[PDB]
Amino acid sequence: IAFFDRIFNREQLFDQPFILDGGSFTYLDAKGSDAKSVKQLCAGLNISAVTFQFIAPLVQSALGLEAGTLVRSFEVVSSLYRLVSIPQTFGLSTEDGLILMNILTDEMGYLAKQPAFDDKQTQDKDFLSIILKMEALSAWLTKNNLTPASLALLLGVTRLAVVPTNNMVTFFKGIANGLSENVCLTTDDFQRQELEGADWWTLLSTNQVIDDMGLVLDIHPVWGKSDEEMLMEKIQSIGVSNDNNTLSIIVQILIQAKNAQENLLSQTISAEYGVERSVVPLQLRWLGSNVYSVLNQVLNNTPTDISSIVPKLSELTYSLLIYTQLINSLKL
Amino acid sequence: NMVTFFKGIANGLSENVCLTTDDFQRQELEGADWWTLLSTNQVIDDMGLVLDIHPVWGKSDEEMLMEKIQSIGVSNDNNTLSIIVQILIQAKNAQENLLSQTISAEYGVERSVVPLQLRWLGSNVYSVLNQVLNNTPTDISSIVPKLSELTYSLLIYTQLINSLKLNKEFIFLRLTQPNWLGLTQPKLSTQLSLPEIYLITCYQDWVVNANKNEDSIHEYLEFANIKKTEAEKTLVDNSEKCAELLAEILAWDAGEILKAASLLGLNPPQATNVFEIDWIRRLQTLSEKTMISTEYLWQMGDLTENSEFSLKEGVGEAVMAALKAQGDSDNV
Amino acid sequence: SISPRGLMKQRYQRVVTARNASKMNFKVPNYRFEPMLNRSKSGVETLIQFGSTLLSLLERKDSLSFDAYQMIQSGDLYRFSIDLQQQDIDINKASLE
Amino acid sequence: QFGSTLLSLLERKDSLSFDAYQMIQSGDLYRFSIDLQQQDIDINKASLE
Amino acid sequence: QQQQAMALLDYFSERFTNESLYTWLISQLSSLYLQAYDAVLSLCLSAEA
Amino acid sequence: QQQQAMALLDYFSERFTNESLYTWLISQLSSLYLQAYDAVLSLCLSAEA
């Protein structure tokens, strides 16, 4: 028996055998009984009916047919067959294949296209290389006990479903409350006879050390050094005075203030997401943000209602959740 | 022993925890006879008890006590107001703790749930204690049948809530959003009913096997339902968010979800309550047992009408194809 | 035919830690600040001791409750054990026959 | 006193976390156990045949 | 073996130190502690003033 | 047996004394302790002077 006919008329399940013909059908819904019949027989190709609707628009688009229609010809057939079989050869669902293809090319329907050997040879063109890549990465994925959906989400290929919540409101306002409670620095903190030499508070807020709201500014760390060392350096850079003693106590003040602020935030985040306080600050910088900026925004906004939340911070929590998933999945 | 129980309660209640007018007699409170005023308003029972306060999903006791005081509007002074609220809170908490632990000791139930359970029995701490001091039966014959029936009902509820794997947040929801629990008629809540029991059944079922923590369910419910009210009767546009979120909760396809809600004909097409969820979940069960399109399933529900040839044809063809796909996705 | 069984799902659980606060003021009392300090610190220490004491009791309780539950739970396996042992006896009877 | 008090709490925590992890970890072996037990049932069916 | 296990459960339950004891104790201490909190808190407020 | 194990895990998790409790407690005490350190340290410095 012919390979084709074997694949479709593998057995008789209906009245008519499937047949390959000219003409088209409104695959989007195929409410027309015959169109539906045709589409169903094609769905007889192993896959779930629902799956069919994910594939068909892409096939139609790639082949250039009218959006609602498909035709009973080898072109449609072969395109579908590619999209089904190829990932299946790696045990990947045809669904998943779309994900990997986008990851590789930012196109889902890539295998819908005809093969090509364009003289304008580019990585996005060799079917064969692309297939080999699919092979390799599939191995790597299973090796690492991953999942294409998870990967795509983490890679930002698709968004995770989230919405504002009462609890997130409570979370933010809780933070703001505790932050207002004692841990926010104040000018009187500098008002000591020992510090009579200058209005440190103003000066340190005119220089980029302090936010007059009562926050220390961010300080990007470095491999070989530690906070007090670079705070020392910052103070030395402003060079207000040579007195090591006043300098020392100033640094002490700044250190402990920072440490309280960051501890508060760290533990709060830890409690919400199940991550260590030890890593929260670094994670935040890897998310591309910092404690100072976060807290600044917090006091700048203090949303009292679910509608009040600034989308900036909503996206912050979204990104945060994402990172938390990543860093929990991997043994970081 | 039940006599001893009641008299024990009365004794401890008489001991310090019953509020007294002198409790208000402080120079700070010189501005008014708060005790009388608060007992003329429906805040205090001159016996020394706080009146009952029906809770609500979004709020907490001190918030509503604050509101009550603001409603009487005796004075603008936040300070006196604050201390008054403090007094009331702590007094209530003592009274309720006493009762809660006592009940807990007798019946083997958590103090954490006693108050809610009592309201589900359709009673409250204030009324209970009021009756107690109003009667204080000294002998087995002395007991008022009212309270005898109270303990009878209580025992019943205890058996129920011990047999089922109930919890505080669940019963809070039950006590607050019957609509969300799909309770067709909240008026029915005066006594237990088989429909209520069945609802509880499928609720616990869903809970014990959903993908992610129940607070996500809480969030989903409130999001879905309150959106049709926070903007009056509207926000149908959230159907997509609702569907995809629920689809994540259930591990399914938002397409099917949307289609199902549309075939239900609900406007907005959103699963507003447990009745809806259970139906949807059943539908998924069949889908994942048969590979049949939910559309076709729901349509098939009408097939008994012996309506017409093409309908029967389409259904049979669909089921046949789905069968082949199921055997494909089973044998091979 | 046989198929494997999927491993049961496990998840983290969020923990809330937000807190509210209320402002308070009171009239000048009879006693000077330092007497008041001594009194207060004594009371505070007593209260702290109480809290910690109670905590330990709850830890005890849950320990016992766990052990009890575990024991009764384990008591059920004997059912199956008895069933199968008796069944073997019957099997030996048949062999003898 | 504060420091020592806190310390004890962390010791408690890690104890619980260990026990939890251990329990869930142990829960997986039942998979294999079920597999092999069922397999033996099938084997006995074949013997009967 | 089953018999020993069941009897052991009973003997354990009959230990004098028992769930009941802790329950009772806790209820008493709870009431005391709450009252103490209210009491001393008032004095501390006065101290701040 | 598997069922008992899984259920036991749940019951254990539902113990009132729980990871969550310790976590919460720790976070509070941590904040207090750090502040106390700063506070008393200042006084001790003054004492040396």
Side-chain angles (χ1 to χ4, degrees), chain A residues 167 170 174 177 268 270-274, chain C residues 12-15 17-21 23:
Chain A
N167 47 76
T170 72
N177 187 39
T268 306
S270 174
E272 174 162 339
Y273 298 97
Chain C
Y12 176 62
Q13 181 172 19
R14 66 168 70 161
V15 178
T17 190
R19 54 168 65 258
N20 69 308
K23 311 305 179 67

PDB file of all heavy atoms in Angstrom, chain A residues 167 170 174 177 268 270-274, chain C residues 12-15 17-21 23:
ATOM      1  N   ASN A 167      -3.971  40.910  49.019  1.00  0.00           N
ATOM      2  CA  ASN A 167      -2.799  40.594  49.811  1.00  0.00           C
ATOM      3  C   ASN A 167      -1.585  41.367  49.340  1.00  0.00           C
ATOM      4  O   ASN A 167      -0.764  41.781  50.157  1.00  0.00           O
ATOM      5  CB  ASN A 167      -2.523  39.108  49.719  1.00  0.00           C
ATOM      6  CG  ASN A 167      -2.581  38.627  48.306  1.00  0.00           C
ATOM      7  OD1 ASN A 167      -1.660  38.855  47.526  1.00  0.00           O
ATOM      8  ND2 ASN A 167      -3.685  37.994  47.944  1.00  0.00           N
ATOM      9  N   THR A 170      -1.897  44.659  50.906  1.00  0.00           N
ATOM     10  CA  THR A 170      -1.522  44.548  52.307  1.00  0.00           C
ATOM     11  C   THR A 170      -0.019  44.467  52.455  1.00  0.00           C
ATOM     12  O   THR A 170       0.563  45.070  53.355  1.00  0.00           O
ATOM     13  CB  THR A 170      -2.164  43.310  52.911  1.00  0.00           C
ATOM     14  OG1 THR A 170      -1.507  42.150  52.386  1.00  0.00           O
ATOM     15  CG2 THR A 170      -3.628  43.258  52.572  1.00  0.00           C
ATOM     16  N   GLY A 174       2.071  47.161  54.426  1.00  0.00           N
ATOM     17  CA  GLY A 174       2.819  46.669  55.565  1.00  0.00           C
ATOM     18  C   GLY A 174       4.249  47.146  55.511  1.00  0.00           C
ATOM     19  O   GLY A 174       4.811  47.627  56.503  1.00  0.00           O
ATOM     20  N   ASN A 177       4.515  50.780  56.298  1.00  0.00           N
ATOM     21  CA  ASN A 177       4.322  51.030  57.717  1.00  0.00           C
ATOM     22  C   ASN A 177       5.589  50.741  58.502  1.00  0.00           C
ATOM     23  O   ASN A 177       6.102  51.603  59.232  1.00  0.00           O
ATOM     24  CB  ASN A 177       3.169  50.171  58.221  1.00  0.00           C
ATOM     25  CG  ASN A 177       2.791  50.487  59.640  1.00  0.00           C
ATOM     26  OD1 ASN A 177       2.783  51.648  60.044  1.00  0.00           O
ATOM     27  ND2 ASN A 177       2.462  49.457  60.410  1.00  0.00           N
ATOM     28  N   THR A 268      10.796  40.394  54.380  1.00  0.00           N
ATOM     29  CA  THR A 268       9.437  40.456  53.866  1.00  0.00           C
ATOM     30  C   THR A 268       9.314  39.657  52.581  1.00  0.00           C
ATOM     31  O   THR A 268       8.421  38.808  52.425  1.00  0.00           O
ATOM     32  CB  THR A 268       9.061  41.906  53.616  1.00  0.00           C
ATOM     33  OG1 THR A 268       9.288  42.658  54.811  1.00  0.00           O
ATOM     34  CG2 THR A 268       7.606  42.001  53.223  1.00  0.00           C
ATOM     35  N   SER A 270      11.275  37.330  51.506  1.00  0.00           N
ATOM     36  CA  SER A 270      11.484  35.939  51.863  1.00  0.00           C
ATOM     37  C   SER A 270      10.189  35.298  52.310  1.00  0.00           C
ATOM     38  O   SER A 270       9.838  34.200  51.881  1.00  0.00           O
ATOM     39  CB  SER A 270      12.528  35.848  52.969  1.00  0.00           C
ATOM     40  OG  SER A 270      12.634  34.515  53.428  1.00  0.00           O
ATOM     41  N   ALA A 271       9.462  35.986  53.178  1.00  0.00           N
ATOM     42  CA  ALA A 271       8.220  35.435  53.690  1.00  0.00           C
ATOM     43  C   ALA A 271       7.217  35.228  52.576  1.00  0.00           C
ATOM     44  O   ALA A 271       6.505  34.219  52.547  1.00  0.00           O
ATOM     45  CB  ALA A 271       7.640  36.357  54.756  1.00  0.00           C
ATOM     46  N   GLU A 272       7.150  36.166  51.641  1.00  0.00           N
ATOM     47  CA  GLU A 272       6.159  36.005  50.586  1.00  0.00           C
ATOM     48  C   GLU A 272       6.519  34.887  49.620  1.00  0.00           C
ATOM     49  O   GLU A 272       5.668  34.068  49.261  1.00  0.00           O
ATOM     50  CB  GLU A 272       5.990  37.300  49.810  1.00  0.00           C
ATOM     51  CG  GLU A 272       5.086  37.111  48.615  1.00  0.00           C
ATOM     52  CD  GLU A 272       4.557  38.415  48.079  1.00  0.00           C
ATOM     53  OE1 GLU A 272       4.546  39.408  48.833  1.00  0.00           O
ATOM     54  OE2 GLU A 272       4.137  38.447  46.905  1.00  0.00           O
ATOM     55  N   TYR A 273       7.767  34.832  49.186  1.00  0.00           N
ATOM     56  CA  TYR A 273       8.117  33.942  48.091  1.00  0.00           C
ATOM     57  C   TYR A 273       8.876  32.681  48.468  1.00  0.00           C
ATOM     58  O   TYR A 273       9.096  31.839  47.594  1.00  0.00           O
ATOM     59  CB  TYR A 273       8.921  34.724  47.069  1.00  0.00           C
ATOM     60  CG  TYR A 273       8.111  35.841  46.502  1.00  0.00           C
ATOM     61  CD1 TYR A 273       8.228  37.122  47.003  1.00  0.00           C
ATOM     62  CD2 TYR A 273       7.201  35.610  45.491  1.00  0.00           C
ATOM     63  CE1 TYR A 273       7.482  38.143  46.496  1.00  0.00           C
ATOM     64  CE2 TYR A 273       6.436  36.622  44.988  1.00  0.00           C
ATOM     65  CZ  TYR A 273       6.584  37.890  45.488  1.00  0.00           C
ATOM     66  OH  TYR A 273       5.843  38.919  44.963  1.00  0.00           O
ATOM     67  N   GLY A 274       9.283  32.516  49.712  1.00  0.00           N
ATOM     68  CA  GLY A 274      10.022  31.324  50.071  1.00  0.00           C
ATOM     69  C   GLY A 274      11.405  31.324  49.455  1.00  0.00           C
ATOM     70  O   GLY A 274      11.747  30.449  48.656  1.00  0.00           O
TER      71      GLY A 274
ATOM     72  N   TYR C  12       5.297  25.330  47.797  1.00  0.00           N
ATOM     73  CA  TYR C  12       5.512  26.292  48.865  1.00  0.00           C
ATOM     74  C   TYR C  12       4.185  26.858  49.349  1.00  0.00           C
ATOM     75  O   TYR C  12       3.145  26.715  48.704  1.00  0.00           O
ATOM     76  CB  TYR C  12       6.409  27.425  48.377  1.00  0.00           C
ATOM     77  CG  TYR C  12       6.628  28.534  49.373  1.00  0.00           C
ATOM     78  CD1 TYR C  12       7.247  28.304  50.586  1.00  0.00           C
ATOM     79  CD2 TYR C  12       6.199  29.820  49.092  1.00  0.00           C
ATOM     80  CE1 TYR C  12       7.421  29.324  51.493  1.00  0.00           C
ATOM     81  CE2 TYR C  12       6.383  30.844  49.980  1.00  0.00           C
ATOM     82  CZ  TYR C  12       6.988  30.594  51.181  1.00  0.00           C
ATOM     83  OH  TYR C  12       7.183  31.633  52.057  1.00  0.00           O
ATOM     84  N   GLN C  13       4.219  27.503  50.508  1.00  0.00           N
ATOM     85  CA  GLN C  13       3.064  28.236  50.989  1.00  0.00           C
ATOM     86  C   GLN C  13       3.481  29.616  51.464  1.00  0.00           C
ATOM     87  O   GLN C  13       4.408  29.747  52.268  1.00  0.00           O
ATOM     88  CB  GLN C  13       2.364  27.499  52.113  1.00  0.00           C
ATOM     89  CG  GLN C  13       1.156  28.242  52.591  1.00  0.00           C
ATOM     90  CD  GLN C  13       0.355  27.439  53.568  1.00  0.00           C
ATOM     91  OE1 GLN C  13       0.856  26.482  54.152  1.00  0.00           O
ATOM     92  NE2 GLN C  13      -0.901  27.814  53.752  1.00  0.00           N
ATOM     93  N   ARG C  14       2.783  30.634  50.974  1.00  0.00           N
ATOM     94  CA  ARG C  14       3.041  32.009  51.370  1.00  0.00           C
ATOM     95  C   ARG C  14       2.813  32.189  52.862  1.00  0.00           C
ATOM     96  O   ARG C  14       2.031  31.468  53.485  1.00  0.00           O
ATOM     97  CB  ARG C  14       2.128  32.967  50.621  1.00  0.00           C
ATOM     98  CG  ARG C  14       0.682  32.786  51.007  1.00  0.00           C
ATOM     99  CD  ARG C  14      -0.177  33.910  50.493  1.00  0.00           C
ATOM    100  NE  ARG C  14      -0.330  33.861  49.047  1.00  0.00           N
ATOM    101  CZ  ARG C  14      -1.290  34.486  48.382  1.00  0.00           C
ATOM    102  NH1 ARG C  14      -2.224  35.181  49.009  1.00  0.00           N
ATOM    103  NH2 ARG C  14      -1.326  34.393  47.056  1.00  0.00           N
ATOM    104  N   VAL C  15       3.525  33.147  53.444  1.00  0.00           N
ATOM    105  CA  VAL C  15       3.308  33.535  54.830  1.00  0.00           C
ATOM    106  C   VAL C  15       3.244  35.050  54.910  1.00  0.00           C
ATOM    107  O   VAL C  15       4.162  35.742  54.457  1.00  0.00           O
ATOM    108  CB  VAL C  15       4.404  32.996  55.759  1.00  0.00           C
ATOM    109  CG1 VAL C  15       4.144  33.467  57.169  1.00  0.00           C
ATOM    110  CG2 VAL C  15       4.435  31.486  55.703  1.00  0.00           C
ATOM    111  N   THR C  17       3.304  38.705  56.703  1.00  0.00           N
ATOM    112  CA  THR C  17       4.019  39.310  57.818  1.00  0.00           C
ATOM    113  C   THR C  17       3.771  40.806  57.948  1.00  0.00           C
ATOM    114  O   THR C  17       4.473  41.468  58.720  1.00  0.00           O
ATOM    115  CB  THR C  17       5.518  39.066  57.691  1.00  0.00           C
ATOM    116  OG1 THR C  17       6.164  39.468  58.905  1.00  0.00           O
ATOM    117  CG2 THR C  17       6.084  39.859  56.529  1.00  0.00           C
ATOM    118  N   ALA C  18       2.791  41.354  57.243  1.00  0.00           N
ATOM    119  CA  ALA C  18       2.445  42.754  57.416  1.00  0.00           C
ATOM    120  C   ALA C  18       1.911  43.003  58.823  1.00  0.00           C
ATOM    121  O   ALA C  18       1.434  42.095  59.506  1.00  0.00           O
ATOM    122  CB  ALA C  18       1.416  43.183  56.375  1.00  0.00           C
ATOM    123  N   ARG C  19       2.020  44.252  59.266  1.00  0.00           N
ATOM    124  CA  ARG C  19       1.534  44.620  60.584  1.00  0.00           C
ATOM    125  C   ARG C  19       1.046  46.060  60.574  1.00  0.00           C
ATOM    126  O   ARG C  19       1.581  46.910  59.859  1.00  0.00           O
ATOM    127  CB  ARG C  19       2.638  44.451  61.620  1.00  0.00           C
ATOM    128  CG  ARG C  19       3.888  45.203  61.230  1.00  0.00           C
ATOM    129  CD  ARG C  19       4.872  45.292  62.368  1.00  0.00           C
ATOM    130  NE  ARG C  19       5.370  43.976  62.745  1.00  0.00           N
ATOM    131  CZ  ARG C  19       4.956  43.294  63.803  1.00  0.00           C
ATOM    132  NH1 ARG C  19       4.036  43.780  64.619  1.00  0.00           N
ATOM    133  NH2 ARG C  19       5.482  42.098  64.049  1.00  0.00           N
ATOM    134  N   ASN C  20       0.026  46.320  61.378  1.00  0.00           N
ATOM    135  CA  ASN C  20      -0.513  47.652  61.599  1.00  0.00           C
ATOM    136  C   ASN C  20      -0.007  48.217  62.920  1.00  0.00           C
ATOM    137  O   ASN C  20       0.579  47.512  63.742  1.00  0.00           O
ATOM    138  CB  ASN C  20      -2.035  47.613  61.599  1.00  0.00           C
ATOM    139  CG  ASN C  20      -2.577  46.899  62.802  1.00  0.00           C
ATOM    140  OD1 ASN C  20      -2.171  45.777  63.099  1.00  0.00           O
ATOM    141  ND2 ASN C  20      -3.479  47.548  63.521  1.00  0.00           N
ATOM    142  N   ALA C  21      -0.245  49.511  63.121  1.00  0.00           N
ATOM    143  CA  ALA C  21       0.105  50.156  64.377  1.00  0.00           C
ATOM    144  C   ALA C  21      -0.844  51.315  64.634  1.00  0.00           C
ATOM    145  O   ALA C  21      -1.365  51.926  63.699  1.00  0.00           O
ATOM    146  CB  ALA C  21       1.551  50.653  64.369  1.00  0.00           C
ATOM    147  N   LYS C  23      -1.504  54.922  67.148  1.00  0.00           N
ATOM    148  CA  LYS C  23      -0.929  55.946  68.005  1.00  0.00           C
ATOM    149  C   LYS C  23      -1.672  56.028  69.330  1.00  0.00           C
ATOM    150  O   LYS C  23      -2.881  55.800  69.401  1.00  0.00           O
ATOM    151  CB  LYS C  23      -0.972  57.298  67.307  1.00  0.00           C
ATOM    152  CG  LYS C  23      -0.429  57.238  65.909  1.00  0.00           C
ATOM    153  CD  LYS C  23       0.969  56.668  65.911  1.00  0.00           C
ATOM    154  CE  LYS C  23       1.506  56.574  64.502  1.00  0.00           C
ATOM    155  NZ  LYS C  23       1.713  57.925  63.918  1.00  0.00           N
TER     156      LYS C  23
END
